[PDB]
Symmetry: D2
Subunit: 138 residues, 4 copies
């Protein structure tokens, strides 16, 4: 499993793939089995003293592992979320970006599985973890 995409290309293709969510998600780092996606909490426009929601944390987890699955499979690969689990461990720090450190554990003929830790930037103890499973059609 070597990448068929670089950080810049994949960021471009993601904006093409899902243009609805423009300026919410950005790649900090990309590597053969690892990605760090960033959720820009300025885009959320929460009231002061507010924190990223459960759904936005889901979104971050889902986009990170999906980006990584695409990273290897390419533009053709039509991968689909089949399962998602999320454990919510610590309240995120208000006003801080959320970072998703995602690794790919399986990329098989029919099924990919990645997991992910989520951090409020600056805080080293993770706010959440998640596993995401996808199916890969023909």
């Amino acid at each position: 499993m070597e990448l068929v995409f670089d950080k810049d290309g994949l960021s471009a293709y993601l904006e093409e793939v899902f243009p609805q969510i423009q300026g919410e998600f950005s790649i900090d780092a990309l590597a053969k089995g690892e990605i760090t996606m960033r959720l820009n909490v300025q885009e959320r426009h929460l009231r002061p003293g507010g924190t990223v929601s459960g759904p936005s944390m889901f979104a971050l987890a889902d986009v990170s592992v999906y980006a990584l699955v695409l990273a290897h499979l390419g533009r053709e690969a039509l991968a689909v979320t089949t399962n998602a689990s999320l454990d919510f461990m610590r309240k995120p720090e208000s006003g801080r970006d959320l970072l998703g450190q995602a690794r790919l554990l399986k990329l098989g003929r029919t099924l990919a599985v990645g997991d992910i830790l989520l951090f409020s930037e600056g805080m080293e103890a993770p706010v959440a973890r998640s596993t995401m499973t996808y199916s890969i059609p023909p």
Copy 2:
């Protein structure tokens, strides 16, 4: 025993979630079951669009959270600790999503509920989910 009624609960959710807005409404509330609707008009999706994974997540979470509040009242500050979602079928574009949630445990410190998500009109569920929340003192 429930401490909220459908409108009491619907009201308290608008209060607590003004972000929710016109997104979620309660079709039915009973002692251990709730049917919550995700009003897909409020999504303002492209034609041929379907409720996203995060939105299904949100429906599952609010449904079980509502049912927890339905029994515990304002007092309980219940917090989501675990969520899982299985995505089984593609929702039918243009329909509301319905969430049939049942509370399986309402403990001193932990609540568990699961949920079947349906595209309105389609009988086979599109997703299912379990949600666990911890209850402070």
Copy 3:
């Protein structure tokens, strides 16, 4: 009460009981089918076969075992002999301590039976106690 595509059984209860003891000789004595319907199965774990000390209760691995055998059996009830469902995911929530000295019942339902993936869920009960001790979701890969 629930609809899914692929509801038809190709086994009856006794033919399924027989096929499970064939494919799994270890299950004979521990797991038996109480009921089988198009959407649903009730499987029994015979608590005596576990030879637990008095006051002792069924383990998490054993509950896992019950939850997984139940949904697997329902998938096979629909797909037949030449179908090789492989477990890909399992989740389990433990809600109450099983009642010591009683069989454990798993009431599974099949929520999906697709081309490549089968999904089902299950509530575990100490027989005769109405509050479920546990709940689970099992998912299986169906290959060619």
Copy 4:
């Protein structure tokens, strides 16, 4: 070197082994601790103790067994004797078949040790095989 609040161990490796064999007499011969650190444990499942048939591999409930005793052992390593961690949720993803005739290793890490809840995750390998056979998350309730 992942960070979490409450990293200090109150047991050392041999000490924790003693305590686990004491509190789980059935575990003796099956599970052993290869390594303990503040944030991680390696537990071994002794494949010989399963007396598996030819070319047969470790069952899912045994893999659940390893994942639960690994994370539970690591939580005990921090909270000590007087603490009663009680499993509340478990998830497992099965990714590859184990290698037949090799022990199974669970490399667990602790992600949270709170007032009421503890969370850890684990990767399962056939020993000497780089690709992990299974991943799991375990959550435990801590009473007062």
